[PDB]
Design a protein around this ligand. Structure first.
Ligand SMILES: Nc1ncnc2c1ncn2[C@@H]1O[C@H](COP(=O)(O)OP(=O)(O)OP(O)(O)=S)[C@@H](O)[C@H]1O
Ligand SMILES: Nc1ncnc2c1ncn2[C@@H]1O[C@H](COP(=O)(O)OP(=O)(O)OP(O)(O)=S)[C@@H](O)[C@H]1O
Ligand SMILES: Nc1ncnc2c1ncn2[C@@H]1O[C@H](COP(=O)(O)OP(=O)(O)O)[C@@H](O)[C@H]1O
Ligand SMILES: [Mg+2]
Ligand SMILES: [Mg+2]
Lengths: 280, 108, 86, 281, 284
């Protein structure tokens, strides 16, 4: 029931549609890349959009091709591209392959500041697919028969300089997604829709923290049981909190549905602000 | 003078008194130190005629510690209490088994 | 921009090879190769050396019980044919 | 006899209980991070809180997270996690894994500093356990059996120098430690509880040195013993002080409890400040 | 025959003996750090002190704390600590591990200077041993066995360029050494004790050159022996001076004691001061 921003949906629609469409005289970028701040919800929006459209999605982890002890990215991206192409025929629906954190989540500090051998391989593989999308080749069992072209989505914080050729060529399209007031109200409104908050209340939350990530507001819901747990500990007592809960056959702890008010959310908001401030 | 009692034997290290869990740990440590691949085999009957034993899962190509091997022996032992179980060590360069010894016998 | 030079500490731990020098006890073969359009020269040569020897692109549990470099044919030289395309 | 701050106690108790409790819908972070200033009572207070509740602790050293073997420290963490996971199923009580001084193990000091592949792996491992705590397996195994969830306690000096994805709302609950006036009075009061000081006197001691770490009071406490030992060394003699203290078949030298007066302690406190000031200059 | 300052002797005697004694309800710091200006007698007076009390020393160089293997300088400190712990058990005497010149081992100077992981891990390891003296382990060998506590002595020029949490009152006792007039007179007097100078003469020597380290006065004696040595080289000859000091089966050359006077000592001291000034007032 989560809200999707109209702009985000439009950018996905046009890219997927145009690639699948067969209009002569027209050139289309195969790869689309989205860069934004962390916890903006780029991954979350992509997954939602595909469900509404009903189009099949193949997901490849950023850490799956960044790790030295994983395999071969060059052999992997090719294999995933072929498999996605098979879905269109069998499934009879549009199929898209997307990558998350191409230059991130590896564990390395640089985050694309310094290139790696593995970084070079992805660039090489992607460039080959973008030039010749219709024909993609594995090491063995070369097939003469062409494959249906498949659109690619990529999300990150920023794009490396190695990709600059593709963008100048116009083979890659870069979309910068930043939330607005209207977008915030939608997303915040969707999260707390089940709780039941007035329109005026939702506006106040966004106004309290004008410059905040989308992830923060979602994280606020989690710290509602804290008061109950803290109070519960006292009745049981510190001496034997562990034993009863960890490995004892008794009735499981029961918590009444937390009351939802704006005051509680502001108090919780301040605490997370303070902690983030001190850490950075 | 003493007459030797009739007793059935089980290849290597069967004449020594029954191996303790510490002793088996030291023998497996030898296999990993040399750089051989450890593997677990099990069989219903112990016969000199038969030379193939059914392999337990697959050879352990990525084993860092001897504890990982012993944990695989305990899994087979709990599953098959009445089967013979042995530990083998494959060498890739020589293309031959280097060490093979029995770790479990059928209980009662 | 700020560039630096460094010293470092180290933790520590497949068919086309032009660096290899042929032995006196080797069987050598010359092929006149014609690939399909959209196939590289070095890729086509690596495919011939693999398929005429052992093949084996994917490693199985049986393959790890033996040496891989010992029994393997390799391409060491590529020469173009004059006045001909691909 | 030692005082634990209620703030510090309630923060630990909730995080550890919440991990063992199952509440539908709520996403609970696995790791709790305690960070602040040096010698403010981060490691010491954790020990006290694990004694009162009576829970089992698995410790990992800070500088243990780098080896002359690739992969080796990353394998270390998974192994210690699974050992703690088994303990819950056997003993039948709470168990916790604490990595102390994680700032000097994984933390990037500065841009200049060059790192190996091991530091990459340790960040990569901790992200996995924080995502799939129930599904932890060793690299290259044929087990894949669901194991028990184990909460992690992490202590450091500066989290500003620590891999960015690790410090996330869903992944790690951070916590900043800084004792207040009341907190200081309680703790310092706990140190000098056997000495016998009035409430007013204890207030004055904190007021005299307000911008001080907790260890600073313990330093002067231990220091009110120097004169006695110095007198003992002279009487015995410098030539035979080793045999009289190491391989002696006699009775250990007793030391009468020194005078613990506010005026004498302020004098001693000024002396320690003077030592720090000399370094600072 | 050398004079050790009573301030320096007391500080060392107390810290070491305190660690071996187990006074109940007292938390003791494991590491003693001594810092001061160069050539003031930090290292030298330690070696005099350990010899007097007759206690065993294990030495770690400062420049030893870097190797091309990751976490290998960190492994060395643990190994050297355990070896010292065995000495107490077997020999039955006090033992001390001493790391001299730690400033150049695990300290960062500017911002430009690129370092390595080892610096980070050396500081990590020293904090651990200070935390848990009884529990020191080696990688690959985990055995539950307690070992005896060993005190550590650290010498440095500047501690400012060192990881902060490692220098705190609980973890390390700090000591600043800067000798006074009475300390100077005592030490310098101890050097020239055999020579035979009056009290007033020794006062004057310190007064003439007040802003000077201890090493200055020990360096002064070397220059008085120049004349005798130069004359010896000439008499033998430059051609065969080598085969008369290294591998010679003859009685070593003997030198008489030079005229140790105030006037002569002053002149020599002025010449050394000029030599120091020359390096300081250098353009490029
Ligand atoms: N609550 C307390 N009761 C008695 N003594 C305390 C208490 N808290 C701290 N101390 C003393 O001060 C020292 C502080 O120890 P830690 O808890 O290791 O400090 P820290 O915050 O972990 O310092 P860093 O950042 O790891 S160096 C202890 O060794 C005790 O001597
Ligand atoms: N007490 C003394 N009695 C006789 N000679 C001394 C005495 N103290 C110092 N000296 C001399 O001066 C030198 C000073 O040596 P150190 O003890 O290394 O000084 P230092 O302060 O440790 O040097 P740094 O700071 O490590 S470069 C000694 O080697 C002796 O030659
Ligand atoms: N439209 C949305 N509705 C609800 N939650 C959202 C929405 N967009 C993002 N989120 C939240 O964002 C988090 C995931 O962020 P992610 O999609 O990975 O962002 P990014 O890729 O920009 O880092 C989740 O907690 C998810 O609930
Ligand atoms: Mg600490
Ligand atoms: Mg020195």
């Amino acid at each position: 029931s989560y809200y999707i921003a109209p702009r985000f949906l439009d950018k996905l629609a046009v890219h997927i549609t145009k690639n699948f469409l067969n209009i002569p005289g027209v050139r289309v970028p195969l790869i689309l890349g989205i860069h934004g701040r962390k916890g903006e919800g780029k991954t979350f929006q992509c997954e939602l959009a595909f469900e509404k459209m009903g189009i099949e999605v193949t997901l490849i982890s950023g850490g799956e091709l960044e790790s030295p002890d994983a395999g071969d990215p060059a052999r992997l991206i090719r294999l995933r591209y072929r498999e996605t192409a098979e879905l269109i025929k069998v499934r009879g629906k549009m199929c898209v392959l997307m990558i998350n954190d191409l230059d991130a989540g590896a564990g390395r500090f640089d985050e694309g500041t310094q290139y790696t051998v593995n970084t070079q391989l992805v660039n090489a593989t992607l460039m080959n697919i973008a030039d010749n999308p219709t024909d993609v080749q594995l090491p063995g069992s070369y097939d003469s028969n062409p494959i249906r072209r498949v659109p690619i989505i990529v999300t990150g914080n920023d794009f490396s300089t190695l990709y600059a050729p593709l963008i100048r060529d116009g083979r890659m399209e870069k979309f910068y997604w930043e939330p607005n007031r209207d977008d915030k109200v939608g997303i915040v409104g969707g999260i707390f829709a089940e709780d039941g908050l007035s329109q005026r209340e939702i506006e106040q939350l966004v106004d309290t923290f004008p410059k905040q990530s989308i992830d923060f507001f979602s994280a606020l819901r989690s710290r509602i049981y804290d008061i109950q747990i803290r109070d519960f500990i006292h009745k049981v007592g510190f001496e034997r909190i562990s034993l009863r809960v960890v490995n004892s056959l008794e009735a499981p702890p029961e918590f009444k549905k937390p009351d939802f008010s704006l005051a509680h959310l502001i108090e919780s908001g301040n605490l997370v602000l303070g902690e983030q401030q001190r850490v950075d | 003078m003493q007459t030797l009692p009739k007793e059935r034997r089980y290849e290597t290290l069967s004449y020594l008194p029954p191996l303790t869990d510490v002793q088996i740990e030291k023998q497996v440590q030898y296999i990993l130190s040399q750089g051989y691949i450890p593997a677990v085999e099990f069989n219903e009957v112990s016969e000199p005629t038969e030379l193939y034993w059914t392999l337990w899962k697959l050879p352990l190509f990525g084993a860092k510690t001897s504890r990982e091997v012993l944990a695989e022996v305990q899994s087979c032992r709990s599953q098959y209490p009445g089967h013979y179980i042995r530990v083998v060590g494959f060498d890739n360069i020589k293309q031959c088994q280097i060490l093979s010894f029995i770790v479990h016998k059928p209980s009662r | 921009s700020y560039a630096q030079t460094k010293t470092q500490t180290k933790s520590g731990y497949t068919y086309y090879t032009p660096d290899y020098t042929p032995k006196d006890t080797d069987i050598l073969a010359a092929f006149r190769v014609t690939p399909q359009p959209g196939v590289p020269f070095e890729e086509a040569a690596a495919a011939v050396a693999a398929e005429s020897s052992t093949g084996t692109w994917t490693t199985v549990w049986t393959d790890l019980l033996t040496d891989l470099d010992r029994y393997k044919g390799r391409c060491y030289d590529i020469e173009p044919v004059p006045g001909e395309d691909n």
